[model samples]
Target: SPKIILLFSGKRKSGKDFLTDHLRHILADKCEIIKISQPIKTHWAKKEQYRLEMIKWSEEMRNKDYGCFCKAACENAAIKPVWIVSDIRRKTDIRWFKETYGDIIRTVRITADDRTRKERGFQFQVGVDDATSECDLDDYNDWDVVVNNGEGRDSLEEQLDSILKLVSN
Candidate 1:
């Protein structure tokens, strides 16, 4: 039923948004870029009571909770052949998508060195940057493709071409 779902992960300012933006332009209506951060709005924060709203909201959403963000993203994916999920952060996030989508799930890790991330305007925050939401996927090495977003267009184009070829199938 579903064709392909690209689950993308990267550190802050790793150009996830930029890559997705260009993807939408190239793939047009055939593709959908689902921001994993979209579900954070569903849960609310009060009096600085929440410990990083992204992390907090996700914790409350159990695997049994079918109405969660990843499920919603899957719903979007079910309707289209090409689905680019932007902002995958945690190990649970990766596991959830793999369990739900099976072979259709293609994990993409976008990588940039510290200097490159700094050049791209990555200034780390306290709780948000240091939390599990940011660090959980940092050590995972099982990505289907690791796209280097640090430098020139040549590297990006090679990865893009490879992705386009896969998605075209």
Candidate 2:
């Protein structure tokens, strides 16, 4: 069992992976990054369709069992004191983590402006962008840490420091 489970949610180019990777590096052997979408991506690895197909397939699986992917991902994750879940898009993901991990769960929401996201290669695709995977958490306001990852912003380290403190004691 993890001492701390950090669940991260963000837009396409909001730097969730960047922050999570940095944390993993700093935490070293004590932490492991778990992605909820890994199983979905691995299952569709042989297919060469666009992102929409992946989104549709993930939705189909989630509809059958909202916590199926979450369970599978965590089951195969490395044994560590801290688990950084880099892609938490849906409310069901939150529910699943909370129910399973209890108070050890911490939610982080990463935000970046449209200009910053554009610079990071974020393009608006109708079906993909409008899907529930992208829009499900739009109204969620109870994030434990909210990070702004604009191009010129330099508070990333400070923001991450706060998260590190949470895992420390």
Candidate 3:
């Protein structure tokens, strides 16, 4: 199998983490789901990611060096067979992942209507969950696939079935 990188790009409460977590639980042993919140060496250096360069969050939006950094890190690490990379939000990042990893990047976009997204308990950056989100536009921009996580488990399960079918095929 390819080293699957499931990059979750969605609004704050659009269930990116939840979807990634679900996949992690199910894909256990077959893959490792990576949340790219910080640089890899931050843990080893005892320094925080925000502190490493004090990058303003919005400015981070325009840059995608992280994908290359992450790829190198993963390739060098003990875990290299398969991986799911979450928290990827930006066109550059998406482009970089596809360019850098080629067939390895399986972009999985999890989404919900805006109002429903705000209720998933994720806070906005320097504002409320309802604040203008970068993800809203991305969700609207279309993707490899879109999962509408709505009211009921059956609805979500049906959407997930699409992803499962994609994976199985």
TM-score of each: 0.82, 0.90, 0.69
Alpha carbon RMSD to native, model 3: 4.4
Answer with 1 or 2, whichever has the higher lDDT: 2
Best by TM-score: 2
RMSD of 2: 2.0
What is the lDDT for 77 in model 3? 41
Q: What is the per-residue lDDT of model 2 for residues 6-56, given as tens digits with 9 covering 90 to 100?
A: 999988888878888889899999998999998987787763365657767
**Which residue ranges in model 3 land beyond 4 Å of their true spot?**
1-3, 40-53, 57-69, 76-81, 121-133, 136-142, 151-154
After best superposition, candidate 2 residue 1: deviation in angstroms?
Answer: 0.9
Look at candidate 3 and tell me the lDDT of residue 152.
48
lDDT of 3 by residue, 38-157 (tens): 453454346344444544543454354546545554554446455677777556666767787787676677666756756764444553243333543354463667777745434556
For candidate 1, the TM-score is: 0.82
Reference-based lDDT, residue 167, model 3? 57
> C-alpha displacement of 157 in model 3, angstroms?
2.9
